[PDB]
Amino acid sequence: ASPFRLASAGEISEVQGILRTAGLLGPEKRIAYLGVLDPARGAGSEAEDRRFRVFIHDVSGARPQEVTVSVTNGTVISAVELDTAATGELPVLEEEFEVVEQLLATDERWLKALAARNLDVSKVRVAPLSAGVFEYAEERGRRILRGLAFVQDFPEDSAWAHPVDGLVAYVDVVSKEVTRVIDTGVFPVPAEHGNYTDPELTGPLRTTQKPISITQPEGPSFTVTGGNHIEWEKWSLDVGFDVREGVVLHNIAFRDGDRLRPIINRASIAEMVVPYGDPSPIRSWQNYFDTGEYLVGQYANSLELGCDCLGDITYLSPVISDAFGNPREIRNGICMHEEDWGILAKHSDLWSGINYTRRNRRMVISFFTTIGNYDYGFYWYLYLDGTIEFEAKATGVVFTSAFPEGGSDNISQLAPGLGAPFHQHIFSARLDMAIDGFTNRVEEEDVVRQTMGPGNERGNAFSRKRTVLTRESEAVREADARTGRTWIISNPESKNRLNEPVGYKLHAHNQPTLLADPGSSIARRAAFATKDLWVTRYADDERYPTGDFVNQHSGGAGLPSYIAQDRDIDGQDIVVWHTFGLTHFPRVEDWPIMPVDTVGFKLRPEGFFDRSPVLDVPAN
Template identity: 60%
Template structure:
């Protein structure tokens, strides 16, 4: 049997608790009192402004200010505001008006998803272009696509979306099967008009079936699947109070943000009564999906799903037995709608345990012993839908001290009409239907705190040694350790040929071997950003050009591509942070790790893509003095052999 518990925060008891419905109502009330929310104002973002570390450690004081950041867009005034306010004092602390040509635009609003179709449905040029293809606006859905920054005329400082059309044959039809190629609309959503229409004439619309639940595609459903039941008759091994989660030595606070989604706060591990900090904050600060097709209808395609579209705001409500399996506890985070009103996402966060295979095992004939122990992991996850793609964000904590992040990508690949067989920049995934090559690149921001704030990063490389008098058989190899001293030196790339890893340690905290305690980051060695170094996307998504960045902690440096990503000209975020070239050896540091998928779509990715995964691991490296799972009991006889998982002799 599977169980679920839904916990919705109703009272704020800690400064890092998630924002509640009452908080959102209070935010709007404060802004109304200041005259900042006329009827034309929309809320592009509302999120917790977290207290400083000084306010949180060793424990937060009773008077810790509860602060919120709000981004307001007013189309009537053509005004973007970045506002900080205090819920404690019920006052606005600061407000900054942005210059869109320099600072960029605020994130895409939910209402703009529909607005682009409304604008195009009334545009004579768009209507005529569809008519030349034998189509009407009623037959066409338009994808609201972020515009980026390019050399197109008369776009600087304007709030834009670009629209690609897809024919929808009936209300339940998955229109991605029918891309309308050779046509793209550049839409000024602020002034509600089409600023430019690129139409190179009709292209045959692919006539494939993309309805993956249609029996005509999937045939008879399987009948040979036997049930798999996940049961925990004594309940789960974790507890949660408010947003404070404890599990078998681990404890943390589960946060949620409309932009980043899941945020892990104050991650600690306790062994033998010794509670130790590992990370102050961990989140996926940005993700970008750049496309590699140079055709004029798609060469501008690159989407920042966090900074432009807000992955947390678009989180799914999860279903027991479908999205999550087992003894489940759900959290229901609250986000703001376009009008600043609270919107609860029921069951938006899933927390549960999973078996994780063998923890350790050995059969020793000398000692006449045969022992095996099973591992398990705690899973904290959410799923989000951004247009055609669906993403799962999974944080795993293991009994052996390992921390893992995994992103799961599924949904429907972006489609186009294939220009010709063997097109160099797309895969043919169905007859006449192309899927352009693209990437899904993420940036994890990890505010490290291993046994305190004095941390550093060393790069560890395998070194192959030639034959020598000291290495007569040529079998010797060793490891090179390089301390990354400054932010510029700490811009690094993975290298699988030397097994490159990065060791994050505290030189002021030593283990029983008198070595600094630490954790090691193991990258996947996946490709970095594929676009030309002097391209617009390379400037705007510079974080994705390298696998590792290390910066000195600063409270306002949260996002790898900067605060205002939508139509930002570039250079913000990590390039600007690292340009200060601050010392990062033995300091309060933030480790940023870029990773992701480079997707050359397969026919098997159509009409819906099986889950593909990417991620990284952080493993304890000298953090413990020995294997921390030695105290695991053997599995009971009811779950394995009659004698259990160890010899009785």
């Protein structure tokens, strides 16, 4: 009955039927995106209407469409033709990936380039990459992918070990034309293999690791109701899944005595960009918007018990649409479990004689996605003490190139002749805040150093200052680790027992933001990534920091255009957008498969409760 329930296979089948009957899903059409729309603000009328948003691509070159459907009523609500030269192309389709390699295999220029390198075309894999927007006027309004080549010596070989540098091609995937083949010169193809399951590379496997057995003899402490509603240790939330964003958390609330207190209305990773920092023309266009261009949810892994998720695991299997509107289940795509998390609180008191220890735990909600060579884990954590944390885990195989003789300022060497270009992995968390309700504000908190003198005669005092962000034009903020800068989201109309506004503090990791020149194409298309924190006034249609149609969009859409409205955010329905990421200079230890590295953020209560919220945790 809950409006936040996961999409069912029956809903998706109904959407397909509604589109087909309306004449919108002929044999030339493909569904590039399908997802449920969240309820609009003020849904306290119970008048549920399950609506789906659909992007429809046409493989014959006709204009694509954006369509909204009500499965409750069985009707098309609206259908708009899209001018993609203006508003951006649709996300890349899984079926377009294979088109690139097949088209290049019959192009005379491509074959001549491979022949010069004595490579068998049957052994050459082509990575199909998003194109971005650069200097090529003929690409405006066309669906382009760019291809980079790797050699696979045999069917089980890791092609990433054998990049074909000096060569790139551009492909129009609708007209099925190779527009350009660029050959800047022959580089040796690195010859060492990177097969991390080959015994010749691994050596004998270790026999020293003894089992760690994690079990829950009475079952887990959380309950799942209505398919996706979780209650755990005073937390309450709904676990959503969207094919673009992946796991989405709704209605995060905490049961404080007899009050269910809201904290976050919607939390998601709303974009993630991977920009490459190699100025070679073979790769200087390379920027992945994994969320906006590729849709990270549709490549979610099925997670295996004992290997991917260890312990007493509860799975969710979300349903998405394939390109024809058929429902597809991602079996065991989301893992949920609780974990011991060390000591929560401890004190041995000399005067009272009381020794006190309590243990912490966290609830984990995670999924893993694979986009070509990279694999990303998305982890949401809820702690007993009210802390909320996100962590991204980056692994997989690094993207490779030749390593030039005489070295490089922009590429690491991993093996003889094998390079890995510098790059970043940058995420945008969209936090639609609801601290004790929807009237919220953001304050920036800095440490304040004080000078020795009157009133501070021993020169020991220090303080802090808080600055309220009152309008969107002043709500674009940068980190300052040296001054301990954090941001507090508070509710000025809801006070704790000390008559202070209740709040939550955002703690960032203070990693570098986007490094590209501010005049670059990527800085314009990924403007969100140039600043650590943005605050906007909530609006139904302001969903992504990069806009709705990211693929081949010329720039400026999303957050820079939203904040130009300069709306009041002082005690209003607000959304916090936090940029955070990893700057990756690959090391030898990242090859041939990369150990996990992590980045994230957390929010901790700041006078939200009237005292510690974990006094009622038992001794265990």
